[model samples]
Target: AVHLKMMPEFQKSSVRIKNPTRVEEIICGLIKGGAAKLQIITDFNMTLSRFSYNGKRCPTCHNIIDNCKLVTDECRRKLLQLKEQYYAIEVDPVLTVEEKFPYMVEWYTKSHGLLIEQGIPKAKLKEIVADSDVMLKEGYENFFGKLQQHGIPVFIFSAGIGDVLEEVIRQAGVYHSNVKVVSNFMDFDENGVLKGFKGELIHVFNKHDGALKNTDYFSQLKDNSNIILLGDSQGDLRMADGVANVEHILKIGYLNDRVDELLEKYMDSYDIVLVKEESLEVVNSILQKTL
Candidate 1:
């Protein structure tokens, strides 16, 4: 019943669908299920948030704090060094994800330790986020508002900082009651200085474990079987793994960088892949018809 030809956004050069027939069938299932049966699972950084703006790279939740004035220049250098070291291992073509897991954990541990040593105060988070150049993808208002209006649950699963991600959502004016964010939250001491992270460390490589741990949240929404998943990384594909019964799931991925190399893999993995795309027009267009 659904035709991709009718959707102009799907025709955009930025959008790529490896199998149109399959996507249409999944979309048809989604439309039939409607709001009551629909749910959203998404990654925050470079997925919901902007990857870059005006030729300058935007910061992730962790970057928001890392680049903030709260951290010393010397400490920033150390953080950048850690990023360089770990990021190389992250994208190494020779290493498997299994090989990169511990490195990702080490990256977060070292970064978080540096942040804690800065004596970051929880009270300054709002102010720091306000000053950062972090922009949500264009058309976010329509994307988030429609879901809230329909009472659809949105689970924002991220590998970034939870407190900063929540603050970003709040500042963007889209943190509705239906949205639940799970990420690495900072644990503050009695004096309000960040002591360490609260619970499990959610790095880019370990989202599967994090997703399964949230079984409590997913199990209660068993009837909401249709899902819309958005993300930028390969690891993000497992975000909805905890959902009890999935009837139909549509994955939309944003291929922000290394496009030529990763494009084919992304197209194969995600039902819809947006290459070098910074707008949510395609998803919003689909929502227009479904909602």
Candidate 2:
């Protein structure tokens, strides 16, 4: 009874469903299971957050940190150098995910170290985020609010700064109890100055490892078998690798760039691909039906 073609949201130019039959099947399950069997697994950067607004790029969690006026010129230069070197491998199509692991860790390490050395005040982070160019997607309120209202479990797995990520959502007033955020949380000293990043550095392409580390989290969500996973990069697809069980899982990818270059790959991997999308309208529409 779920006809994607009939849904107005699916008709938008930005929405691309490579496998409509498959999407229909999964959506049918979501509707039948209702809110009880639903869980959301999403990426924070460039997924829940806007890739760009008003034709200019938005900053990521780490970008917000470095963009802060408090950062030293020396630290910014080092961070810039790190980005020029490893960031290429990050976006390179030929590079293997396994190989990018170490490069990412190194980048994350240097960034964290620089932040710690700068003696970034924990208290300043709130205002730092407030003045930053970071922004959530257009329909973020519905995406987070609807799930909160229904008490569905939402797991946000990101390689971005956990502290900054939480602050963005917290300030937006969407950090509901139903949500669980896992990322590289900042470790602070007694005076609440940045000391280091706690635990392992989880940069892009290393989420699979972090997921394995959180086996207990997935084990507890045994009853929530239907999952709607959202992300921008291929690495984000691994965010659900540790889920204990899955009756039905839908992978929705946000294809924000190089439309012709990666459309085939994205369409092949993701059930539904949103091309140059700046909002969560299609997802919110689906939730409106399911919930």
> Which candidate comes out best when scored by TM-score?
1
Q: Tens-digit lDDT track for model 1 on 12-49? A: 89999999999999999989988888999999999999
Candidate 2 global CA lDDT score: 0.89
Off by over 4 Å in 2: none
Report the lDDT of model 1 for residue 219: 92
Q: What is the lDDT of every predicted structure here?
A: 0.91, 0.89
Clashes of 1: 0
Which digits, one per residue and each the tens of the lDDT, describe model 2 over residues 1-291? Answer: 999889989999988888899899999999999999999999999999998988998888988877788898778787777777876777666667788788887887777878888988999999999999999999999999999999999999999989999999999999999999999898989999988888887888878888888878889988899999999988999998999889999999998766787898889999999999999998898899989
RMSD of each: 1.1, 1.5
In candidate 1, what residue range of length 10 has the lowest lDDT sum?
87-96
Model 1 reaches what TM-score against the true structure? 0.97
